[PDB]
C-alpha cells in the first residue's frame, strides 16, 4: 500500500509578485498649491481639502475645499497588481472558487 499526501503552499515567487485586494473608503484629499501673488512671487504649500485646516506658509494663510464632487475613480473593491490598479471585484476572503 502507498500513503500519498500533498498540500498547497504559496510559491516562492509570492514574495515579489502578488496581487493585493483592497477595500477603500472616501478618504481625504490633499493638494500642493503655488501662490505667486503680490510682490512675493512664490509659495510651496501642501494643503488639505477639509473646510477647517488653515495653511500659513510664508506670510499668507488660506483654507481650501471641500470639493464639490465626491467622485472617486476607485470602486469599493480594488485589486492592485504590482504597479497597475484594477477595480476587479475580488469575492471575499476564504471563498475563492478553484481556477478563478
Amino acid at each position: 500500500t502507498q500513503m500519498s499526501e500533498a498540500y498547497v503552499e504559496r510559491s516562492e515567487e509570492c514574495s515579489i509578485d502578488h496581487a493585493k485586494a483592497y477595500k477603500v473608503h472616501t478618504g481625504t484629499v490633499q493638494a500642493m498649491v503655488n501662490i505667486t501673488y503680490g510682490s512675493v512671487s512664490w509659495r510651496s504649500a501642501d494643503v488639505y481639502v477639509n473646510g477647517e485646516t488653515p495653511a500659513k506658509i510664508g506670510d499668507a494663510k488660506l483654507i481650501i475645499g471641500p470639493l464639490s464632487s465626491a467622485w472617486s475613480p476607485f470602486d469599493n473593491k480594488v485589486v492592485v497588481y504590482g504597479h497597475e490598479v484594477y477595480n476587479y471585484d475580488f469575492p471575499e476572503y476564504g471563498t475563492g472558487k478553484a481556477g478563478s
Binding site: 510559491s11 516562492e12 515567487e13 514574495s15 515579489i16 509578485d17 504590482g82 504597479h83
Partner: protein, 338 residues
Amino acid sequence: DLDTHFTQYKLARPYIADCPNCGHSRCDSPIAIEEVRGDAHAGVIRIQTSAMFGLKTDGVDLAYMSFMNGKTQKSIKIDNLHVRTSAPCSLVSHHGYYILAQCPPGDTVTVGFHDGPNRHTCTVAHKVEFRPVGREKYRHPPEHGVELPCNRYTHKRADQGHYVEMHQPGLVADHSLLSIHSAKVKITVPSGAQVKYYCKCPDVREGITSSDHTTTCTDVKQCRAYLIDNKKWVYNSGRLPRGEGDTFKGKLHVPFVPVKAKCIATLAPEPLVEHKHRTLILHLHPDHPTLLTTRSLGSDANPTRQWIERPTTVNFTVTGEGLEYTWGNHPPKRVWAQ
C-alpha cells in the same frame, strides 16, 4: 567565498528517480527533474534535478557534477551538461540540486549530461512560454529599448529568502547486493550501511547488519535488498519513498530566489501622426503585436484597447475635453481639440 554553503554541499548527497521519459522509455535516471519554475519574464528557467552538482567529493571543483550511479556516487566533469527545449538552451549557473538556465519557448524541457561512454538524458512534459514585460508582446530580448521592472530569478546563489527541507532519505532496494553463496542468497554491505532485510520465507526479519547470509529463501527475487543510507540526507522528493523513522533536519535555502530586477524591453516605432478637423488619425506600423489604449479626458472615458499586428490606420474623435493615447510602452501622450 563559495565555502559558506556546506549545508547544501556536505549534508546532501546525489539522488536518483523515475524520469518519465528517460531516453526511449521511463528508466530511473540520475538526473530526474522536478518542479521546473518557468514563471519569470526574461526567458530564464529554474530546474531542480535529482542529481546534485556543486563541489566535488570533499570541498573543491565547483565546475564538477556529482550524480549517483548504482550504490555509490561519482563526481566527474560537467563537460556536456545539456538543457533543451523546442530549441537548445544555454546554461547560466548551477548549485546543488538546482540549475538555472534560459530556454526558448517549447512544450518540453530536457536535461542531459555526459559521462563519456553514456548519454544519460532525461526530460518531462511542461509548457514553457515567456511574455516580455511591457505592452509589446515580443518573443526575444531585444538589443535596445526602455527598461521595466520585470520578474526574474536571481543570478546569484548566496541567498536565503526561501528554504527547502532535506530529511533522511528512505531505503532504496538493490538486488545486486544479493550475491550467491553456492546454494543460498548472501547480502553484502556498501560501507557498513544499514540493510533492512527479510524474504517471503521466514528468516532474519529486520536487517541492521554487516554482510549477512539467508538461511531460508534461495531465489534473490523474493528478498528485501534494502539500503538505509542516511549518512548524507536528501530532499523529500515525491519519487523517493519515506523513511519511517523521522524527518531529519537540514533545512536548505533555495539557491536561486526570484527577484524584481529590471529587464530591457522592446520599443515600437513611433507612429506617424496626421491631424484633421476634430479627429486624430494615427498612421502607424507595428513591428510586433502591440496594444494601444485610448482614454477620453471628459466625464465619459470611452476607453478602447486593441492589439494590432499588421500595419493599420486608425482614427479617433478628439473632443474639446481632449484625448490621450498610449502606443506600445512609449510614455503616454495627450492631445487637444482646436
